[PDB]
């Protein structure tokens, strides 16, 4: 491996220098004319110089599990970490089969959901039936939402407050932000009767205050009646939703505080607070382990699908026209939720970096991802995640937990530093440790035979200068007892080190205005910037890897440019960011005239090697978005065609008009 010198005075310092460094504890391993900076080196170069295998000090990161199960194991871990060296341990996830479920059905009662309401009243029996087929201890609940009761969301005229529905229908209910109809119960008959009393409502604008409702459901676990079991929140609507910022139209500027505001099964302070943020809701949901199931109509599926990126444990199922398929929707959504398992860690310090290897029973395996991700998880078929933890520093006492998203079960990880050694005369002021003498304060020497301020005589300075033309200790250090003691500069991040004090941590190439990206992506060691985990480069000026080069479908700078350091390197006049279009290129209409002739009209010079002569052209019998072209063919007639460019080098989608322009012939 690699080991580059930094702090060479001690054993622990030798380990702190690099993750590939080793220290030798052989007494008098050094020659009479040798420095002790050669005691610290790579394991091969130690053995090569004759350092015994027994006495080589190489502390290595270790993982030790105390066993304590079978869903999240082990639930206790202790990690001993060397800086730079990654410790690894395995986490086994075996899906449990019969864990109870609380399902809260949050129904949209806006007027657009009029036809949907009728099927929901029959839902009670079937919903609990299917729920009890999945697991035991089934519990169903119900709630309803419309919108904030102020303009422009709701017509606040007293007559249309009492009857919001456009038609004069007689079975209507005044608008409301959120009402809690039924506390979670095992009684199916209650559900049918209590939800049955609920009427249809209405309001003004299409998006509704559904997020207000969900936030309340998550913030009032006592009122709703969640058990500490698996929690499902079925969100059913035919339209969009209001979120934070929309309240300003009703002159509502106060952010949702994410707390319970229920007055008699009602959200009465709804107009005193703004709609919750999606980021707010996501946090509140994940914190209470409430997995939302978004049952939305076909027109709204793609939209609500985006929420699943912010909310890890959520699923979207398409709701049929009159909410007839709602039950099959929920179970299909539950499978989608249960088949995919995320493994993550709570908040991490700047010193610790954690990655995940995912080994799935699905037959798929991911390596070194920031979050454990396995889909297609089957019951009792165990999957394993390999956790890799790396420390940048020697660290203090710490504990961070790893849990599987959707479950309260946790894996407690203890983290202890590993910078020490356990190592198996000195002429006075020095006590000996790990094969070398560590002198008292004010004294320095291999056997502590010199004093910092004192005599320090001649002809020991022979070793102090690099060559015959070098200054003693490079002029950046003092020569004591034959070796060099470097000066101390008060400039932050500056340290003079080296056998002849020839190296400094300041001089390196610059990104931004600072050195090696400042105290960020990299640190500087004697001209070379040693980058922190996750970054690379000379001055570490390029950031990470290939994500700044992609089109939304990941084709990497179209096909017209190859990516280095996220700046797309593209040929000719194709400009940035994605190297998609060339404004300076000449019009390609001229050369493809023979290909257009052979594709459409079977004739022309390329008759019968049309396929071989036109590798980049894809013929379309319908008009295309490309650029207009028109040229003369082989026999002199004018042929019109259009060239739409696709991702790649000289790859076009060509359309040719069947009608040719001759003079008559």
């Amino acid at each position: 491996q690699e080991c580059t010198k930094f702090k060479v005075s001690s054993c622990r310092e030798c380990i702190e220098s690099g993750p590939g460094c080793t220290w030798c504890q052989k007494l008098n391993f050094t020659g009479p004319g040798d420095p002790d900076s050669i005691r610290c080196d790579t394991r091969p170069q130690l053995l090569m110089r004759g350092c015994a295998a027994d006495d080589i000090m190489d502390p290595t990161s270790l993982a030790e599990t105390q066993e304590d199960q079978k869903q999240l194991s082990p639930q206790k871990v202790t990690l001993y970490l060397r800086p730079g060296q990654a410790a690894a341990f395995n986490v086994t996830f075996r899906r449990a089969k019969g864990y109870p479920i609380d399902l809260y059905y949050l129904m949209d009662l806006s007027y657009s959901m009029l036809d949907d309401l009728r099927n929901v009243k029959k839902l009670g029996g079937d919903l609990l039936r299917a729920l009890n087929e999945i697991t035991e201890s089934g519990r169903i609940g119900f709630g309803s939402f419309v919108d904030k009761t102020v303009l422009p969301f709701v017509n606040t005229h007293p007559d249309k407050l009492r009857n919001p529905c456009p038609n004069k229908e007689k079975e209507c209910q005044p608008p409301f932000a959120f009402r809690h109809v039924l506390k979670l119960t095992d009684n199916s008959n209650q559900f049918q009767t209590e939800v049955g009393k609920q009427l249809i409502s209405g309001n003004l604008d299409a998006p509704e205050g559904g997020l207000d409702a969900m936030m309340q459901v998550a913030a009032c676990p006592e009122e709703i009646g969640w058990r500490k079991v698996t929690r499902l929140l079925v969100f059913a609507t035919d339209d969009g939703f209001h979120f934070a910022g929309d309240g300003k139209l009703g002159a509502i500027l106060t952010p949702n505080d994410g707390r319970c505001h229920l007055e008699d099964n009602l959200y009465k302070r709804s107009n005193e607070f703004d709609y919750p943020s999606v980021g707010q809701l996501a946090h509140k949901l994940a914190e209470n382990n409430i997995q939302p199931i978004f049952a939305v109509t076909s027109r709204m599926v793609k939209t609500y699908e985006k929420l699943t990126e912010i909310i890890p444990k959520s699923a979207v199922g398409e709701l049929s026209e009159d909410s007839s398929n709602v039950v099959q929707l929920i179970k299909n959504a539950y499978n989608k939720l249960s088949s995919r398992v995320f493994l993550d860690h709570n908040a991490l310090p700047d010193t610790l970096k954690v990655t995940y290897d995912s080994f799935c029973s699905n037959g798929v395996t991911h390596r070194n991802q920031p979050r454990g991700d396995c889909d297609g998880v089957q019951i009792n078929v165990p999957i394993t995640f390999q956790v890799k933890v790396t420390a940048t520093e020697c660290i203090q006492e710490q504990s961070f937990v790893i849990r599987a998203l959707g479950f309260t079960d946790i894996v407690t990880v203890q983290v202890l530093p590993q910078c020490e050694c356990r190592c198996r005369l000195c002429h006075g002021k020095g006590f000996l440790e790990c094969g070398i003498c560590r002198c008292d304060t004010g004294y320095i020497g291999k056997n502590c035979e010199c004093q910092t301020q004192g005599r320090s005589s001649q002809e020991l300075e022979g070793s102090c200068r690099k060559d015959n033309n070098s200054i003693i200790c490079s002029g950046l250090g003092d020569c004591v007892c034959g070796q060099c003691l470097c000066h101390t500069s008060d400039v932050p991040g500056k340290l003079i080190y080296g056998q002849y004090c020839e190296c400094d941590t300041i001089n390196c190439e610059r990104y931004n205005g600072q050195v090696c990206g400042g105290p960020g992506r990299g640190l500087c060691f004697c001209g070379k910037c040693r980058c922190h985990p996750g970054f690379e480069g000379s001055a570490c000026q390029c950031e990470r890897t290939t994500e700044g080069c992609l089109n939304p479908r990941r084709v990497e700078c179209s096909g017209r440019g190859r990516c280095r350091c996220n700046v797309c390197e593209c040929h000719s006049g194709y400009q940035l960011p994605l190297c998609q279009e060339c404004p300076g290129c000449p019009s390609p209409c001229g050369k493809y005239i023979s290909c257009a002739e052979c594709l459409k009209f079977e004739k022309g010079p390329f008759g019968k090697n049309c396929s071989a002569a036109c590798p980049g052209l894809q013929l379309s019998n319908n008009p295309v978005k490309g650029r207009t072209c028109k040229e003369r063919d082989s026999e002199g007639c004018w042929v019109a065609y259009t060239l739409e460019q696709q991702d790649g080098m000289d790859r076009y989608l060509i359309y040719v008009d069947e009608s040719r322009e001759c003079c008559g012939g």
Partner: protein
């Protein structure tokens, strides 16, 4: 970094919602809104003007209309200058219309030089029921004078009680004669309705009521007379109930009227009521119920009390169309939700417009306000909340309008509108990414270089969510040219605030660090549990905003009880009267005015006397003596103020604390201050502008071990500017990035030379050469030299880049100004005589660097031992400099490809057109000339007639025509090679079109049109021939050079083929 935190202005008014909206005004006041404050019964929102002088706020007196209910006045504020105007709005006006209640807005336009007026100019109107009303008055002899005079006053009273054009009137006077004084159409066209009633004179005569009513029904109620179809038809009959001589009875005409659905009112005159016969006459005329349709002639209130009627509109709620229902249009518009001032007038953003598809109203003075929004075709704009935020943008002359749509597809987007041919049109869009991030919530135009043209639009996404931080600001440079608008970079606040709402408020503070680049201020009202924070971002060359903040001010940092600090921002003006730009920050129940502190720059000059330490210092019989040799050091600190626009600023006193160190880091210091007893000294001195020097006494021991390395003296200092006492203890401060550590070397006790050359190039093209390599050879022919330092001096566009001999280099500005320098010290090495070092020094050449036509690179050479210098051996070399640019001309797709003509059409001709378009793809503006070469003749025979170059787009260009004579060749042979007619063989017509300034990415469109003749083809002896025109770009070749390798694209050509078939 110069926002003053410790000396602070606090505005506290206990009104509900105070501080939700702030704005700087007239360089005098901080206008503050309190939209939740209850000012009157059924009226909300209040304004407060605040002053630095008063240190207090006073309510802004405004009289508000009664129909403006709960407007939330001050929910949005806007102001401008020259002339200073204030625009305060309230978009939540509740307006009752039928059983519906609309939501519109109202704004007040204020100014000291002018009178306060309102926007929109007129009140929102409820839709009223169309009703066509006919007056039928008895003008017979039985009606007499005061009775007939009363009837007219009754008519006048009624007409004044009904709005137009909801209600239009028609009057006919009857007797035995019928006269229509004014028809419906005449009434509607009438400039003044009341003017028509002046010419009405009584007809006397008999009384024919029935036949008159018939005449009214069969005439006065028709499309031909201007009667509306949907209008409720009401006929007012005014008579004394005495019918005489009429061949018709009421039972004959009344049923015919009932069938038409005509409502009838019977107004009784004189004895009409008391006579039993005359009373029946009234009952018969009036519609049922009779009691509700009959009144006296004296009762003017009678007619209105029943109807001031409206049409009941049924909305299409939740975006669902009923067959009967009607779509939202402007009823929920909420005009004035956001506001901004434009040169052509104020602009009020209306969010709820057309099912919340949003938009904006431009209000030019004394004209019809024009509505600005996405086209009707775009249905995805519904519920996008366009115009949630409004901001003005300017590129040179053109004024553009940016509107925010934070709800667009739940993602949010911003759209730029510009005027194209008397009508507004979308030019560009940019969409956010994360759902519910509210991208486009806040808009802020930034002019970085202050040329009057907007460079950079900041777009807020307050609710952008990441696990460890929240909020986001996208830096979006204007889509100049025809490039698609995209966001160049993104700004974030500090982390630990997942819901911190970074980007809720945006304002331009102006250049505060004096780099002649605009700095901006961004708010984050949600940070640390809704206390709030405010960030300051410096401007950056090649207009962009600095990725990291210069200064962050938390709410907790200034005060407890502070909530939502940064929810509103306004800066760029001076309100503290010290001439420095100030910042007004919004907060819950408070408004804080922060002031920028004046910026100071400190420079140091350090020298030793004598120059090189005489070696008589160390020569002894070994006496134990020390400090026998004294050395003087002259240290000068001159302080120039960076802020050149500060009122007062004549005596800027500044306190400085100096520290000193002799050979720091070394175990045994070789020097001592005569004063302190050690190697550490301190000084505290009050300093002003210009300069202040000071000498110090150094002591050197007789015999010392290290005589090789020079003695160093390290200097640092803290600077605390003395409060000015004028401007309320305002203090100056040292620049944050300033160098605190200064070091001078004192050498212990040669003739050197320098030489270099540029490998690879004889000339430097700026933009095409991003680096510069100089091969430097330094030699020492003579005595040995220590601490050899190689010094460079160069223009600003160059800098020393360290690549991967050993060198330690540092770079810092020198000269009057404009010149920089980089001196590279070499040690680790004794430089011995006869030995020479050659090394490659690399300079970074800025793409925008202005080096003129000449680049002078000078190289010094020196040693620790200071020679008398001026001994030549300073090498300068000059390099000719040109500037790169990418300019392309290309033949357009749409032109005249060919022309077919029969063998008998020689006499005739046909219209032919050639089109070229020119684009500046380079990074540099440039004066180009465009040349067009067109054949118009062949052997004095007409070929292309009346050729005219046109440019409808960019119609401020300027062209000329010049005839050309062809080099006389044997064209029949020249044609035979390839059948092409151009300037080589034919007579040409040269067009020169000069472009004084060709902007970057700008496109020029040209069109050469004319009549192509057929006859000349008979000279050719070919069946078909090509007619070619050539376009060529020319710029000053001495100052500019086409992008290397792309030279071929500077000329283009277009071909039109003349073919002749045979019939």
């Amino acid at each position: 970094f110069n926002l003053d935190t410790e000396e602070l202005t606090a505005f506290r008014v206990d009104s509900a919602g105070f501080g939700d909206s702030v704005v700087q005004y007239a360089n005098s006041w901080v206008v503050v809104g309190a939209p939740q404050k209850i000012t009157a019964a059924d009226q909300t929102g209040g304004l407060y003007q605040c002053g630095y002088s008063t240190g207090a706020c006073e309510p802004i007196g405004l009289q508000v209309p009664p129909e403006a209910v709960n407007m939330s006045l001050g929910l949005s504020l806007a102001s401008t200058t020259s002339p200073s105007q204030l625009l305060a709005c309230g978009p939540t006006v509740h307006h009752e219309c039928g059983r519906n209640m609309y939501l519109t807005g109202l704004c007040f336009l204020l100014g000291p030089t002018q009178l306060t007026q309102r926007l929109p100019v007129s009140r929102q109107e409820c839709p009223r029921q169309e009703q066509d009303i006919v007056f039928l008055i008895d003008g017979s002899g039985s009606i007499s004078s005061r009775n007939f005079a009363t009837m007219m006053n009754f008519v006048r009273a009624v007409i004044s009680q009904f709005q137009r054009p909801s209600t239009q009137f028609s009057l006919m006077q009857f007797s035995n004669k019928f006269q229509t004084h004014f028809t419906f159409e005449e009434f509607r066209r009438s400039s003044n309705p009341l003017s028509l009633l002046a010419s009405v004179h009584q007809l006397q005569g008999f009384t024919y009521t029935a036949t008159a009513i018939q005449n009214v029904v069969h005439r006065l109620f028709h499309a031909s007379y201007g009667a509306r179809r949907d209008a409720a038809k009401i006929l007012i009959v005014i008579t004394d109930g005495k019918k005489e001589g009429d061949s018709l009875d009421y039972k004959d005409v009344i049923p015919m009227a009932d069938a038409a659905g005509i409502i009838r009112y019977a107004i009784g005159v004189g004895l009409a009521f008391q006579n039993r016969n005359s009373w029946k006459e009234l009952n018969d005329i009036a519609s049922k119920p009779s009691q509700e349709h009959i009144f006296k002639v004296e009762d003017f209130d009678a007619l209105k009390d029943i109807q001031n009627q409206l049409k009941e509109k049924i909305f299409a709620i939740e975006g669902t169309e009923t067959t009967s229902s009607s779509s939202f249009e402007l009823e929920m518009a909420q005009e004035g939700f956001s506001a901004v001032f434009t040169p052509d007038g104020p602009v009020l953003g209306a969010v709820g417009s057309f099912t919340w598809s949003g938009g904006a109203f431009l209000y030019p003075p004394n004209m019809d306000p024009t509505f600005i929004n996405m086209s009707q075709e775009n249905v995805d704009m519904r519920d996008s909340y366009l115009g949630y935020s409004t901001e003005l943008a300017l590129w040179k002359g053109v004024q553009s309008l940016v509107l925010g749509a934070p709800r667009y597809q739940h993602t949010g987007k911003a759209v730029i509108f510009t005027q194209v041919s008397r009508q507004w049109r979308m030019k560009a869009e940019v969409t956010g990414t994360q759902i519910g991030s509210y991208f486009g919530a806040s808009l802020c135009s930034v002019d970085v270089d202050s040329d009057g043209s907007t460079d950079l639009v900041l777009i807020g996404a307050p609710h952008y969510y990441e696990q460890t931080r929240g909020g986001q600001v996208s830096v979006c440079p204007l889509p100049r040219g025809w490039r698609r608008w995209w966001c160049d970079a993104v700004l974030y606040g500090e982390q630990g605030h997942p819901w911190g709402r970074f980007g809720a408020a945006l304002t331009v503070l102006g250049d505060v660090n004096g780099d002649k680049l605009t700095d901006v201020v961004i708010g984050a009202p949600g940070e640390e549990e809704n206390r709030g924070a405010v960030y300051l971002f410096h401007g950056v060359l090649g207009p962009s905003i600095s990725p990291s903040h210069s200064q962050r001010i938390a709410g907790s940092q200034l005060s407890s009880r502070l909530q939502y600090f940064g929810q509103a921002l306004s800066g760029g003006q001076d309100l503290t009267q010290d001439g420095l730009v100030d910042l007004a920050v919004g907060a819950r129940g408070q408004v804080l005015l922060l002031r920028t502190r004046p910026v100071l720059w400190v420079g140091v000059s350090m020298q030793f006397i004598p120059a090189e330490i005489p070696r008589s210092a160390f020569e002894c019989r070994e006496q134990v003596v020390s400090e026998q040799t004294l050395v003087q050091s002259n240290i000068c600190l001159y302080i120039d103020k960076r802020s050149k626009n500060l009122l007062g600023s004549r005596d800027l006193q500044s306190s400085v604390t100096l520290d000193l160190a002799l050979d720091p880091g070394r175990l045994s210091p070789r020097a001592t201050f005569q004063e302190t007893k050690t190697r550490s000294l301190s000084r505290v001195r009050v300093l002003g502008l210009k300069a202040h020097c000071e000498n110090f006494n150094l002591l050197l021991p007789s015999c010392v071990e290290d005589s090789v390395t020079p003695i160093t003296l390290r200097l640092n200092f803290t600077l605390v500017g003395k409060p000015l006492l004028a401007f309320r203890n305002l203090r100056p401060m040292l620049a944050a990035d300033a160098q605190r550590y200064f070091t001078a070397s004192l050498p212990f006790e040669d003739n050197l030379g320098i030489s270099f050359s540029f490998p690879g190039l004889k000339s430097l093209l700026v933009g095409s050469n991003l680096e510069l390599n100089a091969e430097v050879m330094v030699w020492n022919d003579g005595e040995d030299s220590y601490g050899t330092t190689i010094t460079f001096s160069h223009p600003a566009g160059l800098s020393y880049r360290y690549v991967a001999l050993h060198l330690t280099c540092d770079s810092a500005p020198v000269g009057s100004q404009g010149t920089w320098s980089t001196s590279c010290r070499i040690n680790h090495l004794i430089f011995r005589g006869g030995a020479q070092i050659t090394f490659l020094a690399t300079f970074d050449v800025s793409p925008k660097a202005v080096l003129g036509d000449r680049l002078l690179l000078t190289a010094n050479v020196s040693s620790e031992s200071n020679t008398p210098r001026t001994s030549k051996t300073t090498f300068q070399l000059e390099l000719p400099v040109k500037y790169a640019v990418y300019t392309v001309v290309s033949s357009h797709e749409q032109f005249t490809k060919y022309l077919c003509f029969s063998e008998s059409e020689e006499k005739e001709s046909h219209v032919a057109m050639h089109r070229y378009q020119v684009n500046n793809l380079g990074q540099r503006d440039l004066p180009v000339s465009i040349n067009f070469w067109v054949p118009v003749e062949l052997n004095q025979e007409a070929v292309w007639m009346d050729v005219e170059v046109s440019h409808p787009q960019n119609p401020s260009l300027r062209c000329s025509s010049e005839k050309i004579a062809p080099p006389a060749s044997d064209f029949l042979a020249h044609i035979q090679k390839n059948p092409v007619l151009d300037c080589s063989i034919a007579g040409c017509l040269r067009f020169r079109c000069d472009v004084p300034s060709f902007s970057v990415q700008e496109e020029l469109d040209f069109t050469l049109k004319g009549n192509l003749s057929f006859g000349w083809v008979r000279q050719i002896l070919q069946k078909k021939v090509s007619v070619v025109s050539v376009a060529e770009i020319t710029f000053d070749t001495s100052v500019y050079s086409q992008l290397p390798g792309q030279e071929a694209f500077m000329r283009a050509q277009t071909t039109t083929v003349l073919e002749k078939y045979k019939p």
